[PDB]
Amino acid sequence: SVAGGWGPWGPVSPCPVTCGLGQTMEQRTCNHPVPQHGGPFCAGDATRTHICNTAVPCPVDGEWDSWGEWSPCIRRNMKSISCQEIPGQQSRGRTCRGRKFDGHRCAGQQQDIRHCYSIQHCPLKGSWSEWSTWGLCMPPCGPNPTRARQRLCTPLLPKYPPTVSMVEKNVTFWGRPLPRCEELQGQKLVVEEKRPCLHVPACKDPEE
Amino acid sequence: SDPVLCFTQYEESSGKCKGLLGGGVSVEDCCLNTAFAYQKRSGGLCQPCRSPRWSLWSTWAPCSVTCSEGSQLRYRRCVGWNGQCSGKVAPGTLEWQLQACEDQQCCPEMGGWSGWGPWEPCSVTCSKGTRTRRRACNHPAPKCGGHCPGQAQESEACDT
Ligand SMILES: *[C@@H]1O[C@H](CO)[C@@H](O[C@@H]2O[C@H](CO)[C@@H](O)[C@H](O)[C@H]2NC(C)=O)[C@H](O)[C@H]1NC(C)=O
Ligand SMILES: *[C@@H]1O[C@@H](C)[C@@H](O)[C@@H](O[C@@H]2O[C@H](CO)[C@@H](O)[C@H](O)[C@H]2O)[C@@H]1O
Ligand SMILES: *[C@@H]1O[C@@H](C)[C@@H](O)[C@@H](O[C@@H]2O[C@H](CO)[C@@H](O)[C@H](O)[C@H]2O)[C@@H]1O
Ligand SMILES: *[C@H]1O[C@H](CO)[C@@H](O)[C@H](O)[C@@H]1O
Ligand SMILES: *[C@H]1O[C@H](CO)[C@@H](O)[C@H](O)[C@@H]1O
Ligand SMILES: *[C@H]1O[C@H](CO)[C@@H](O)[C@H](O)[C@@H]1O
Ligand SMILES: *[C@H]1O[C@H](CO)[C@@H](O)[C@H](O)[C@@H]1O
Ligand SMILES: *[C@H]1O[C@H](CO)[C@@H](O)[C@H](O)[C@@H]1O
Ligand SMILES: *[C@H]1O[C@H](CO)[C@@H](O)[C@H](O)[C@@H]1O
Ligand SMILES: *[C@H]1O[C@H](CO)[C@@H](O)[C@H](O)[C@@H]1O
Ligand SMILES: *[C@H]1O[C@H](CO)[C@@H](O)[C@H](O)[C@@H]1O
Ligand SMILES: *[C@H]1O[C@H](CO)[C@@H](O)[C@H](O)[C@@H]1O
Ligand SMILES: *[C@H]1O[C@H](CO)[C@@H](O)[C@H](O)[C@@H]1O
Ligand SMILES: *[C@@H]1O[C@@H](C)[C@@H](O)[C@@H](O)[C@@H]1O
Structure with a gap:
């Protein structure tokens, strides 16, 4: 008498993630219409796997960009140490990029420091x-x-010493x-x- | 709204997409999780959803000539989704390296013929056989493997 028809696909569980996409199941019922008086049941599957979208972005941890170039080799209270056996210091930096929606800040040193000899010019x-x-x-x-x-x-x-001290640290030649x-x-x-x-x-x- | 294949992870070592969630999603929705990766078509280039970094240099393509001095290309790729790789270079952009190459120092030079020799015999135990003749590149002998144009043998009949 009345042949069954499938109702619309619906969810079966809450989406199991709190951000971005997840994997769930959707189900439907043979009740649109319900079969009556010997009419056939609905053909095919009542269940399927589905991706669910929360439409919510996940936190994104910051990430160090690449180290920049070494600053010039210099000593604190000296105009110049170049072409002299006088250890200086130089530094290079990096920026924590891309931290987003309450993601973690980048851990460790934003600045890198080392001892140098200046042979610049x-x-x-x-x-x-x-x-x-x-x-x-x-x-x-x-x-x-x-x-x-x-x-x-x-x-x-x-032929300068590879190392130095403050009563041993590596000293690198720098400069053209x-x-x-x-x-x-x-x-x-x-x-x-x-x-x-x-x-x-x-x-x-x-x-x- | 250009459906992509969404993956649960990126293999750093290989740059391969792993753990397919499935299709019918935008990159925008896939990458709501920056831990995820996508493919724009089934089997092709896996893009991670994190920040853009340079991929591995590819394998050197084979040499443009098989005998002489040629050159060969390889590439690396801007792979990621929110930003730029090095300079103002957005993802799916190739960097190229072009290298000289050589398969052999020499190229094959062509030969010239000498002159047909004297004929062989047929068969005498019984009747109807075949008779052939020969030659070689004793002329401009081929340089680097090379080849003479035409035939080195030649046949005929003899009723005996
Ligand atoms: C000074 O530089 C040297 C390299 O010139 C560093 O020496 C290496 O130290 C590591 C330990 O983390 C070892 O794995 C390597 O075998 C060392 N290199 C050698 C022996 O050639 C050293 O770490 C630097 N720092 C100090 C404070 O000496
Ligand atoms: C639920 O609430 C969200 C706002 C985030 O805080 C979620 O953390 C994220 O969990 C997903 C899987 O659900 C992972 O892919 C991420 O690595 C993680 O940051 C939280 O579970
Ligand atoms: C590739 O294999 C080499 C061993 C040669 O046989 C090549 O043939 C030569 O190709 C060069 C230029 O690439 C030309 O001199 C001739 O086309 C040919 O002799 C082959 O291509
Ligand atoms: C439900 O399944 C399909 C439609 O998706 C058909 O077999 C028929 O409409 C049935 O009700
Ligand atoms: C469920 O699936 C699709 C829509 O997701 C259609 O086949 C139809 O709406 C069905 O009920
Ligand atoms: C800076 O330090 C070195 C390069 O000198 C690398 O470990 C890395 O590139 C980092 O950005
Ligand atoms: C500083 O160290 C040397 C230059 O002396 C290079 O490796 C690079 O320029 C870095 O910034
Ligand atoms: C420059 O380098 C040295 C001398 O400074 C030589 O070995 C070379 O031939 C050239 O004159
Ligand atoms: C290509 O560049 C260098 C080698 O030429 C390495 O950093 C790495 O192999 C990259 O793929
Ligand atoms: C370069 O020229 C040749 C090698 O190609 C040699 O005379 C020497 O190695 C020089 O550096
Ligand atoms: C350049 O030429 C070839 C390599 O293509 C070699 O003779 C040598 O490596 C040189 O640098
Ligand atoms: C020998 O064969 C023919 C002539 O018989 C030509 O292709 C050419 O002269 C070759 O040496
Ligand atoms: C052999 O065939 C004839 C002579 O036998 C000529 O065309 C030529 O000399 C070739 O070597
Ligand atoms: C020589 O003799 C005859 C009888 C057969 O053996 C042949 O095949 C052969 O050429």
């Missing part, structure tokens, strides 16, 4: 390096990819010295070979 004796390996082809996707290798007047660094070489192929600092990269392929997104 310091003239040193040099010797010529052997050829570097060929660099990358630049620009890699642009018009005329060329690769390079160099010989550099590399500086001979002073001015190394002194015999002229090689008309150059005082850098000799370069360039050459074109051959049969260059067009670079096309590998996600079409």
Whole structure:
């Protein structure tokens, strides 16, 4: 007489997460209409798995950005220590990024500090390096990819102590010295070979 | 409202999507949890819902020529959803590296023929056989593997 029909999908439980999406079940009933006097029951499943959306954002913990560059090597009550066996100090910083909806602040040091020697602009004796390996082809996707290798007047660094104290901490050389070489192929600092990269392929997104 | 596949986690090591919740959700809804990850299409690039960081450099593509000096590409990807990677670069943007490459120092050079030799015999135990002739690249002998154009053998009949 009356063939059963399914009512609408409805939830069976509260969504089990307090933020973002979760996994629940929805159910429906054969009562739209109810079967009567020998009419068929509803075909298919009364139950299914469903994603439930709370539409509520979860907390997001902050995350350190990358360390910045080292500040210049300096000593507290000295105009300059460069080209001298006088330990200085330098620092670099990072920012806690992306902390949101009551997420945790980033733990540990916002500032990084170390002992240095300044050889900034310091003239040193040099010797010529052997050829570097060929660099990358630049620009890699642009018009005329060329690769390079160099010989550099590399500086001979002073035989200073690796460590220091306040009655042992590591001391690092910092700064671009001015190394002194015999002229090689008309150059005082850098000799370069360039050459074109051959049969260059067009670079096309590998996600079409 | 462009349905994505929503995953419960990102494998840092591999950059793979793991624990599919399922589809029919926006990235916006998927990423309400920044611990989650998505795919815009089934099987492709997994994006985490956290802040954008550089992916791993890919494998070097094979050399553009098989015999000579060529070059080969590889990439890394801006992967994440709320922000930028390094500079003002938003996600799904590729960085590229182009490297010189060589499969062999030499390329195969082509050969030239010499001149057909004297013929062989057929079969004498009984009748109707075949007779052939030969040659070689004794001329411009092929340089690097190479090949001569045409045939080195040649056949015929003999009724005996
Ligand atoms: C000073 O720098 C040195 C490296 O030049 C650090 O030495 C390393 O220390 C760690 C301990 O955490 C060891 O795993 C390594 O084997 C050490 N390197 C070696 C022996 O080459 C050291 O941590 C730094 N700090 C101090 C205070 O000395
Ligand atoms: C319920 O209330 C929310 C406002 C948050 O405080 C929830 O914490 C979050 O829990 C989900 C799973 O429910 C995790 O993915 C998150 O890592 C966590 O921050 C809280 O359970
Ligand atoms: C790839 O395999 C190599 C061993 C060679 O057989 C290549 O063939 C040569 O390709 C170069 C330029 O790429 C050309 O001189 C000729 O197309 C061919 O001899 C092969 O492509
Ligand atoms: C319920 O199930 C499907 C519709 O989703 C059909 O088999 C029929 O409408 C039944 O009532
Ligand atoms: C439940 O499922 C979909 C809607 O989610 C439809 O098939 C229909 O509304 C059904 O009742
Ligand atoms: C800063 O410290 C080092 C780089 O010197 C790394 O551990 C990391 O990049 C951090 O941002
Ligand atoms: C400071 O340390 C050196 C420079 O001497 C580099 O590793 C880098 O520039 C860092 O900021
Ligand atoms: C520069 O480097 C040294 C001398 O300073 C030599 O080894 C080299 O040949 C070039 O003259
Ligand atoms: C570079 O030139 C050749 C090697 O390619 C050598 O003479 C030497 O290694 C130099 O550095
Ligand atoms: C550049 O040329 C090749 C590598 O492509 C080698 O001879 C060497 O590594 C050099 O740096
Ligand atoms: C590519 O860049 C360097 C190696 O060239 C590494 O940081 C890492 O392998 C990355 O995938
Ligand atoms: C030998 O074969 C033919 C001529 O018979 C040509 O392809 C070419 O001369 C080759 O050396
Ligand atoms: C063999 O075939 C004929 C002669 O036998 C010529 O076309 C040519 O000399 C080839 O070597
Ligand atoms: C030589 O003799 C005859 C009788 C058969 O054996 C043949 O196959 C063969 O060529």
